[PDB]
Amino acid sequence: RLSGEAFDWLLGEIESKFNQAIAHPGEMVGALAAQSLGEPATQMTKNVTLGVPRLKELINISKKPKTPSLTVFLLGQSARDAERA
Amino acid sequence: QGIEQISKVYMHLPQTDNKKKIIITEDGEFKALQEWILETDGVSLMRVLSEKDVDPVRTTSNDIVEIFTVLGIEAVRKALERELYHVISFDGSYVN
Amino acid sequence: TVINNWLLIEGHTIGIGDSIADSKTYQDIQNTIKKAKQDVIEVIEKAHNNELEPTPGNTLRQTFENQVNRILNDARDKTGSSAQKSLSEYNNFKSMVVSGAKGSKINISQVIAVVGQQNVEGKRIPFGFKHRTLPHFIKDDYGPESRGFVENSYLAGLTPTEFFFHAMGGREGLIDTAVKTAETGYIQRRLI
Amino acid sequence: SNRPVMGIVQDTLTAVRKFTKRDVFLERGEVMNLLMFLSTWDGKVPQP
Amino acid sequence: MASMRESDTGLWLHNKLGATDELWAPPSIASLLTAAVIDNIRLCFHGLSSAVKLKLLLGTLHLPRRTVDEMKGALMEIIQLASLDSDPWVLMVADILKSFPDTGSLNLELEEQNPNVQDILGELREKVGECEASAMLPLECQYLNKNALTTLAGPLTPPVKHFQLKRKPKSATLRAELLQKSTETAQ
Amino acid sequence: AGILFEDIFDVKDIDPEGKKFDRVSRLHCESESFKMDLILDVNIQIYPVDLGDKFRLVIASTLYEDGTLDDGEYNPTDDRPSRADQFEYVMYGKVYRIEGDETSTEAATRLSAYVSYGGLLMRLQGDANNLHGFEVDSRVYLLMKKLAF
Amino acid sequence: TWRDLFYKLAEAHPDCLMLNFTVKLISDAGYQGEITSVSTACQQLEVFSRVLRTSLATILDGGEENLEKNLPEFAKMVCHGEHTYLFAQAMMSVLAQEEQGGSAVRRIAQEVQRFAQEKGHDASQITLALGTAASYPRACQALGAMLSKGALNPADITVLFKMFTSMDPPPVELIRVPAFLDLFMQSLFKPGARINQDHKHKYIHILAYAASVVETWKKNKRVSINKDELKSTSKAVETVHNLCCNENKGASELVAELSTLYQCIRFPVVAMGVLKWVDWTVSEPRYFQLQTDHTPVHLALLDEISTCHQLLHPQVLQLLVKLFETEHSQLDVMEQLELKKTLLDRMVHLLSRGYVLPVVSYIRKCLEKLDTDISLIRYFVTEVLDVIAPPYTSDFVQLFLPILENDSIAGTIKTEGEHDPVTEFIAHC
């Protein structure tokens, strides 16, 4: 139920707030991302071995993960009947 | 019978909508469905995807080297992003 | 500034009186723990006479462990909930938890109701000796208190066996900190 | 994580939870004493 | 609270209470009865139609007790003025309602040269006398205990015995089975 | 004047969910003439009430009969005539929500005015006719006084 | 059809002359009945009075089976006009003044007032003014407010408890209106209804006084008050209410106290409240999903209700009909078949205790409606003829001969054996 003046003010405020959200040139996004990913790594402790070890296996591309696995999705009618799975 | 380096398979029913099958109904609703899935203990990704009655679209591999070898460099990038998101947001935290 | 200056009038504290039940919740907690012990004994004897159907995908021992752990966790959760119901609006633990300043529900549960099961490496207390955790037990005992379940609360004090088991459980936290800090510092350095 | 890193901690949080309850009433003297600590106050006492 | 004149009061009454579809007096009549309107009805009651009289008289009871207490004499006056209308409906309603402002109850007099009332009372009374044994127990009798039912409408009269039973029905078997099950479970 | 709404209420019930707060009590009241429901939070410590009580409730825009429309700041040194001289319980708050059975085609027959007196909430639910002085984000005085009748 | 067209035209164009001329020609020709007369009946005094008299005479002639048939039209005619409703209630109250046979008249008045309330017209305060509530204005005001708002409030209940428990209780018959007691049972029996625990004792005392405490009246004069059923009855009410409103407790716990349950279920008000609590409790479709017994304890309590009191049989029948007509599309057909077989056993029990005619009629209707499995009908009729023995009344045989006349029973139950129930019943008649 906004009025005309309220709508004009709303358009102006949106246009003003969007321009302040643009990324500033010269921002060191690489170091920022590195810090923002290393911070939760210091605050984390069927069997998929999550946590710091999983992050280590992902960051260090290794051909021998501890628990490799696939999530197989059944295609058709066998996805419902247990025995047909 | 079977495929090598596949030690055993677990039969699973996803109780979370992330692994559930979501298909839009005829009237626009989402109506997430529940379907049987399998969780293996090895990686083939090539003789498994070729198997009949196995979905060749939604089947993932959880291993980035094998996904790189089989599907490509953008597929491995997407899989790596998903693995990182899972391992970071498992505890309930959030990263942009 | 404003809230701190009003706190001079309102005041805030915590004491022994905030860790006491109504002597009726104690009966409920004791009955729940007794029922859990009886259920675990029933599972143990049914395992001994070989009437367990193995879990489809897992060994017999692991499903026995799952049954025991499920029973113990259900008992601990029920006791904690019963303790939470007993708390009055004047309780200081509740006041400091609902505001989120410090503590959690499990803290009140452990202080009042029961400490719960102790775990090392994600499993119950291992057979450090030959088929018994401590010399005070008999060989091949899979009961709750024998494998590291603390049935007492921090207010009621811990018996020596569960005290030692709690020490075993608490050691792993310091060990994990001391190794994880050095493990993750290297990851962060490589990222940056 | 596009969220504040600074909040209200320790006993200030507990006291602000106990202070905004429905049954918290203040006399004029304590109201003036509290208003003395507002840096951004405009000097007008609100109608009780 | 303006003084609404006789023709004007009649117009107002036939506009607010002119809904022939609303044979029910609406609850708004509770707010439609004030001192001035009741006082001025003294002259416009002649021109009101019978439906208007019936609706107003039925709405006169839907008033607060304090309002009736503070507006007694005017309501007695309107009752006595309604007791001089061509329709016997208004006469009887005013006669019974004359005791409403005094004690809060309604008067009970019938068979006073009222042929329809006479016929109804006589025939219904004689029919009840004919079928006194075969009465219609109200819903509260479904709730009343033995003593209350005997005091009100007499002891319970069993229905017609259709036949007799040679084999005990399975309801007794279920009762015994569940009694045994409850004994086993509780003990 | 500035009398937005006036009626007689009787306390049909006290807080049915239990005493959430010791000093503040919830009251469910019914009307006598307009038959509208009322839910109110009162400081039971300083103005104790119990079931079966009746009171005059006079919601007013301003306490001054001449309607000078004061700003709304506390000035105890004011010798002008006020309505509070003939009422026992006075609260000052703002109306923050107006509900109704509004349809997409025709108007609303029932309204529900929500007012907050600095934490103590009141909901006045009734027919739309009696609730016309209520406009959202406006200041309101309570002005209730118990009746001995 | 053309007469209806004339009625529509006369409504649309009242000013026109030919429409009035056609209406008067219709009246003279003898078709004045087809003219609108639902509202014309209210505006006429003597004709409406005679119609009411004839309808009530026919009602009292044919019993409750004919009252159920004559009630709709008569009630609609009476309650469509407020003046007609007032006069009708006045004559019913006057006739009910007699203590001899006045129960039927009071039931008629209750039906009329219930029908009026179902139409959105409230006249409960008028009924209170009709009675002897003048000496107790507080009770009249309280009950009027409670019935007007249609809820249970602690204030008026506290007032009523204070006055009735005092040395001069008001007329108990005033608070014996079925609507108030139905609301009270909704409050203290229906799951999900919350009541004040600090006034629950007052609620129980009020219910006990309204139900079990008895008074003697001669010439409408209070003589003596029997209060024997006040301590044990109130304790039973409290225990039953605690059992019913504690929905977190399982049904096994309720069965575990079956001795006390049966002891308390032997009172009419308590038994009817139990049946109502079961009614709302099972009315949820998900209850059968949470009900893990082929022959549950609720049906046993229904059997106990049927055995305990004869007046409660219509309520048990209504609950059984509600259960059976409930067609389930969310459970396996086998459990539905088991539930229907158990319901058949319950309604066989209802038939055994003398409640034969409505049960037999309901079975006949179901068989002629094909909403019941043929196996269910066969087993029901087999057990009925297994438990019952000759001789049989004229009504029973008249209702049961067409039951065997259906081929779905003749081709199924008729078996080669020394004791053939269908052959025996055919031969004996």
Automatic annotation (TrEMBL), chain C:
Places the protein is found: Chromosome; Cytoplasm; Nucleus
Parts of the chain that traverse the membrane: none
Superkingdom, taxonomy of origin: Eukaryota
Signal peptide, first to last residue: none
Record's function text: DNA-dependent RNA polymerase catalyzes the transcription of DNA into RNA using the four ribonucleoside triphosphates as substrates. RNA-dependent RNA polymerase that catalyzes the extension of a non-coding RNA (ncRNA) at the 3'-end using the four ribonucleoside triphosphates as substrates. An internal ncRNA sequence near the 3'-end serves as a template in a single-round Pol II-mediated RNA polymerization reaction. May decrease the stability of ncRNAs that repress Pol II-mediated gene transcription.
Family under the similarity heading: Belongs to the RNA polymerase beta' chain family.
Protein name: DNA-directed RNA polymerase subunit
Organism the protein comes from: Sus scrofa (Pig)
Residues of the full protein shown: 674 to 865 of 1970
TrEMBL record, chain F:
Gene Ontology terms, MF aspect: DNA-directed RNA polymerase activity
Highest taxon in the source lineage: Eukaryota
Pfam families associated with the record: RNA_pol_Rpb8
Gene Ontology biological process terms from the UniProt entry: DNA-templated transcription
GO CC, alphabetical: RNA polymerase I complex; RNA polymerase II, core complex; RNA polymerase III complex
InterPro entries noted in UniProt: NA-bd_OB-fold, RPABC3
Main location (coarse class): nucleus
Family membership noted in the UniProt record: Belongs to the eukaryotic RPB8 RNA polymerase subunit family.
Its job: DNA-dependent RNA polymerase catalyzes the transcription of DNA into RNA using the four ribonucleoside triphosphates as substrates. Common component of RNA polymerases I, II and III which synthesize ribosomal RNA precursors, mRNA precursors and many functional non-coding RNAs, and small RNAs, such as 5S rRNA and tRNAs, respectively.
PANTHER family: DNA-DIRECTED RNA POLYMERASES I, II, AND III SUBUNIT RPABC3 (PTHR10917:SF0)
Official protein name in the record: DNA-directed RNA polymerases I, II, and III subunit RPABC3
Annotated gene: POLR2H
